[PDB]
Ligand binder design. Structure first.
Ligand SMILES: Cc1cc2nc3c(=O)[nH]c(=O)nc-3n(C[C@H](O)[C@H](O)[C@H](O)COP(=O)(O)OP(=O)(O)OC[C@H]3O[C@@H](n4cnc5c(N)ncnc54)[C@H](O)[C@@H]3O)c2cc1C
Ligand SMILES: O=C(O)[C@@H]1C[C@@H](O)CN1
Ligand SMILES: OCCCC[C@H](O)CO
Ligand SMILES: OCCCC[C@H](O)CO
Ligand SMILES: OCCCC[C@H](O)CO
Ligand SMILES: [Cl-]
Length: 540
């Protein structure tokens, strides 16, 4: 029998599915999420979230909560190699070199928060916004027809139930039920190496003393691996490899064998070790050839598995959720055509390919197997995560505008179409407001001081297309009043690419520039031009 319907069914309740639920619910889209596990993750995989992801958590309403939960990890500022935690230090450096001078580009910083503490924050936020989260519930099969998707659900309580949606968003991980049902092929290097993550309890306070590490590379004759200690210094995760080609297998990782390895990594006799969880995983590079299959969308690790060297995977998946959610909201609202959904593939798949390659390059670099060309190809994590340029029907390039790389120095992009609309602190009323805090719900049009023709065009297009558009003139200095944003520094038009006083920029709900005009329309047809821009972007 039926167990309901909703515009969107989300499969998977890890970071990408929970993020999808939050962003859809924030746009007022009713969704149901199914997660086979009885609750959120027991074994944390992700720990590091780059500043763009911090900006996306702020849009989600959970960044401040995450930063408060992470306050113990805030001191873990050093990456190190050691023989053991008790033993000799082999190298020591900063975890993210210039985390300290990001302030010109973003108000966020590197966030270190284990995944098992971030997921509950997203879960509680999704529930507050009205998402229907069904844990202990597995998607078994589905079928698409011209009007929707019918899913078969198993909550273990005997019999299966059907669910009917308009869209199915597969956030169901590297072995995606949905991707495999659809027989979507994946490209890339495939499986490179086999690993186990060993979550452990051990009192490390006497061994670490006052030292606090982000990540520790351990190398001694008994164990080679990565240790990440927790904020209370009473446990962590030891990540090791094994080689089936040498007769090693997962079966080898008994509790006793895991405790031996953790003890060897800690290096202090008499340290009592508790094994909390053993998480097997493969180091892999595999990207789906397409992320949109009619009414079925692939997001996160269902769409792309990247080598975890560089910590890009959850960052990339949360940005996928953020890209798709506003698009499904506008299609479900009847304000956009279904072509807008296809742009999820056009925009996120090339990022996924680039990011998967970056993970692979980091792995080559750390493995000492990197050619001089592969070394030169490694990008800054802020370039990978903040420097993206989209090409799709939801981006309208300037006539003179040139084709941008998939990712490049974010400091140079200066609000080009398809890139992140820059962070500028402006004034509204008596408050400071970030450009970033204007974005996340509606289209936003920001104009120069003399941009009233573009403002008028936004008011007209809003009525004509049934679309809310926030439109403001940005006025340099502090001599500004109601209906404007003040730009005390006079930085805004330069940071947005040298917009003239009559110029304008149109920002999508995801904070990506859709379109800009340096000045007035040459033909004085601002109203017709902005309407045509929005019709193209909205696939109508
Ligand atoms: C050791 C390690 C370290 C990492 N460190 C970082 C890091 O620091 N930063 C970072 O950004 N990323 C990191 N990553 C990557 C990150 O963990 C993943 O990219 C991320 O978890 C993917 O999220 P997801 O929601 O797409 O998939 P998953 O986390 O794989 O979750 C998928 C969910 O779907 C559920 N599911 C599957 N099939 C079904 C079904 N049929 N019905 C219902 N539910 C289903 C599963 O139970 C699971 O809970 C790391 C990964 C590893 C392995
Ligand atoms: O669920 C289990 O079987 C164990 C219990 C805890 O140690 C975490 N994992
Ligand atoms: O570096 C420690 C990894 C050992 C793997 C294990 O020995 C498989 O049998
Ligand atoms: O408890 C240590 C923090 C979590 C680390 C994570 O498990 C690494 O994948
Ligand atoms: O003099 C300070 C100006 C405040 C700006 C105004 O509130 C624009 O919205
Ligand atoms: Cl990763």
């Amino acid at each position: 029998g039926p167990s309901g319907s909703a515009p969107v069914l989300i499969v998977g309740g890890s970071l990408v599915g929970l993020s999808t639920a939050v962003f859809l619910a924030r746009h007022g889209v009713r969704c149901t999420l199914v997660e086979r596990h009885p609750g959120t993750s027991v074994h944390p995989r992700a720990v590091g979230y780059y500043p763009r992801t911090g900006e996306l958590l702020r849009q989600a309403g959970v960044e401040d909560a995450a930063v408060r939960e992470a306050s113990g990890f805030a001191t873990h500022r050093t990456r190190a190699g050691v023989t053991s935690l008790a033993g000799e230090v082999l190298f020591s450096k900063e975890e993210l070199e210039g985390d300290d001078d990001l302030g010109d580009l973003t108000p966020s910083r590197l966030l270190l928060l284990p995944q098992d503490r971030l997921e509950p924050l997203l879960r509680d936020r999704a529930v507050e916004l009205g998402a229907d989260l069904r844990f202990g519930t597995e998607l078994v099969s589905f079928a698409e027809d011209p009007e929707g998707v019918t899913a078969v659900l198993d909550d273990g309580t005997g019999g299966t139930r059907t669910f009917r949606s308009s869209y199915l968003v597969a956030c169901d991980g590297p072995r995606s039920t949905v991707r495999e049902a659809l027989k979507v092929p994946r490209q890339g290097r495939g499986v490179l190496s086999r690993h186990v993550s060993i979550a452990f309890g051990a009192d490390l306070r006497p061994v670490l003393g006052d030292r606090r590490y982000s990540v520790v590379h351990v190398k001694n004759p008994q164990v080679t691996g990565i240790l990440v200690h927790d904020d209370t210094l009473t446990g962590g995760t030891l990540i090791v490899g094994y080689r089936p080609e040498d007769g090693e297998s997962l079966e080898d990782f008994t509790d006793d064998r895991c405790a031996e390895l953790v003890g060897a990594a800690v290096g202090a006799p008499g340290v009592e070790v508790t094994i909390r969880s053993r998480f097997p995983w493969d180091m892999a590079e595999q990207v789906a050839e397409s992320f949109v299959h009619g009414r079925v969308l692939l997001a996160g690790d269902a769409a792309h598995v990247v080598p975890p060297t560089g910590g890009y995977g959850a960052n990339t998946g949360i940005a996928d959720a953020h890209n798709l959610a506003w698009k499904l909201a506008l299609v479900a609202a009847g304000v956009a055509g279904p072509g807008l959904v296809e742009t999820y593939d056009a925009e996120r798949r090339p990022v996924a390919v680039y990011t998967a390659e970056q993970g692979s390059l980091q792995l080559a670099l750390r493995s000492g197997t990197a050619t001089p060309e592969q070394q030169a190809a490694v990008a800054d994590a802020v370039t990978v995560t903040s420097g993206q340029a989209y090409r799709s029907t939801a981006v309208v390039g300037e006539p003179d505008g040139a084709d941008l790389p998939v990712a490049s120095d974010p400091r140079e992009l200066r609000g080009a179409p398809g890139t992140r609309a820059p962070y500028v602190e402006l004034l509204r009323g008596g408050e400071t407001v970030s450009t970033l805090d204007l974005f996340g719900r509606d289209f936003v049009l920001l104009t120069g001081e003399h941009g009233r023709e573009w403002i008028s065009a936004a008011v007209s297009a809003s009525a004509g297309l049934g679309l809310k558009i926030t439109a403001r003139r940005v006025v340099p200095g502090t001599d500004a009043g109601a209906g404007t944003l003040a730009d005390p520094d006079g930085d805004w038009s330069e940071r947005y690419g040298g917009l003239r006083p009559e110029g304008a920029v149109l920002v999508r709900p995801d904070g990506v520039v859709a379109w800009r005009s340096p000045g007035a329309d040459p033909g004085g047809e601002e109203s017709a031009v902005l309407a045509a821009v929005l019709r193209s972007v909205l696939a109508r």
